[PDB]
């Protein structure tokens, strides 16, 4: 109900919406300045607009706040609740020993090339399509890749918003 | 040693500096793109330029990431390590019931007016200093107070950076 959302104290808005962009409560906190919102689509558009206003370093910064697929945080149970549910849904918590080693190698190569983690909308992908995209995007130019990765962040945000 | 800092992977850079601006690891993560840093002043400068580049809503957002002095998070024991240390130095952890309620009322007034929390560099202020600032800053226009509060965020950041050092 957008009416209840529109009446929220910023403290409660930030609590509810503070992880729609992974570990970036600043973004959701910022857009509360634009209330009242017409609907959830309005919130979505405002978030997208905010992200796009950032310098490229800000965009790379958002990416760097994300955990690796199947990496150290998954393995040690220190993912955010949303990342945990997304990674598990995409097959990341039932990978076999060879599958884990492979994801480590791919992630390593990606972060070395681009200087930020591999981000994908896990809810919209399975194991196989994730491996495929990791390899494909590895071939991209930095400028094109940053755009690709931020689009994934926006898809994740949209799904998280609609889960609240 | 600025050379050790300059050689950090982004994951380690974000782990170490991710809370120099409260609950805003994005800021530390962004500035890593501008490495190598000439010195600590270069890091601070880059942080300041980044914040300065945000829309006003981004600046308000940063402020909204900060917890209230003597507020729910202090009482519940859920502050970040740096905030817990800072609020303790400023006398916020040894308040009596009257004082805790007084702080709640002052914060409620400020946040109602401005639409973000009252932020002050707690390491440079005592309990009485805080109450005085809480009352004087309440008089400010919103345009001016946002600028004032962001200046305090940068002071907090500077001290957080110096404590890592």
């Amino acid at each position: 109900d957008i009416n209840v959302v529109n009446a929220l104290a910023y403290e409660d808005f930030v609590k509810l919406f503070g992880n729609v962009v992974e570990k970036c409560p600043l973004i959701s906190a910022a857009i509360w300045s634009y209330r009242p919102f017409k609907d959830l689509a309005d919130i979505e558009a405002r978030i997208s607009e905010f992200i796009h206003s950032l310098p490229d370093s800000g965009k790379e910064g958002i990416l760097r706040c994300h955990p690796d697929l199947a990496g150290r945080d998954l393995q040690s149970g220190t993912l955010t609740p949303e990342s945990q549910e997304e990674q598990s849904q995409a097959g990341m918590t039932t990978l076999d020993s060879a599958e884990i080693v492979h994801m480590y190698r791919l992630n390593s190569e990606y972060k070395e090339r681009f200087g930020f983690p591999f981000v994908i909308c896990a809810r919209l992908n399975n194991k196989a399509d994730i491996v495929r995209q990791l390899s494909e995007r590895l071939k991209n130019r930095r400028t094109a890749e940053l755009e690709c990765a931020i689009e994934e962040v926006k898809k994740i945000c949209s799904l998280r918003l609609h889960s609240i």
Side-chain angles (χ1 to χ4, degrees), chain A:
Chain A
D1 183 356
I2 198 72
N3 284 159
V4 39
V5 168
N6 279 341
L8 257 21
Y10 67 71
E11 280 161 77
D12 295 323
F13 190 89
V14 174
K15 269 189 269 196
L16 192 64
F17 291 97
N19 204 231
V20 302
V21 180
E22 180 87 327
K23 288 172 185 186
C24 293
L26 152 78
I27 299 179
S28 75
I31 57 94
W32 182 86
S33 283
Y34 303 121
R35 73 188 157 68
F37 306 104
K38 187 156 183 244
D39 42 31
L40 197 52
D42 195 355
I43 294 182
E44 283 179 302
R46 285 297 194 166
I47 290 172
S48 176
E49 155 184 311
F50 187 92
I51 291 171
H52 289 284
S53 73
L54 297 173
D56 276 5
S57 61
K59 291 164 177 185
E60 303 172 306
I62 286 163
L63 296 180
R64 291 170 191 144
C65 289
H66 288 70
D68 275 10
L69 287 170
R72 174 187 289 113
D73 295 353
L74 179 100
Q75 298 307 331
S76 16
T78 55
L79 291 177
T80 62
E82 298 92 342
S83 277
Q84 174 72 30
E85 299 187 77
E86 291 154 6
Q87 291 210 19
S88 62
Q89 151 161 352
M92 298 297 99
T93 68
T94 58
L95 292 172
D96 66 33
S97 45
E99 278 177 321
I100 301 169
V101 166
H102 193 206
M103 285 302 295
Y104 188 96
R105 193 177 325 121
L106 291 176
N107 275 316
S108 184
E109 288 179 28
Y110 184 96
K111 81 180 61 168
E112 173 47 45
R113 177 172 175 96
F114 294 115
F116 45 77
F118 179 76
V119 170
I120 194 168
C121 185
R123 279 219 232 172
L124 299 183
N125 295 91
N126 62 24
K127 205 150 69 162
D129 301 298
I130 287 174
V131 171
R132 184 181 46 85
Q133 297 271 30
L134 238 166
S135 294
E136 210 62 16
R137 290 165 50 181
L138 196 54
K139 315 183 180 204
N140 282 328
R141 166 180 158 180
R142 303 186 100 92
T143 53
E145 184 57 13
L146 180 63
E147 182 74 345
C148 181
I150 288 287
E151 285 310 317
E152 291 304 301
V153 172
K154 302 195 307 196
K155 291 172 194 172
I156 293 160
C157 181
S158 282
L159 284 161
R160 292 188 181 183
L161 278 165
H162 286 275
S163 284
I164 303 153

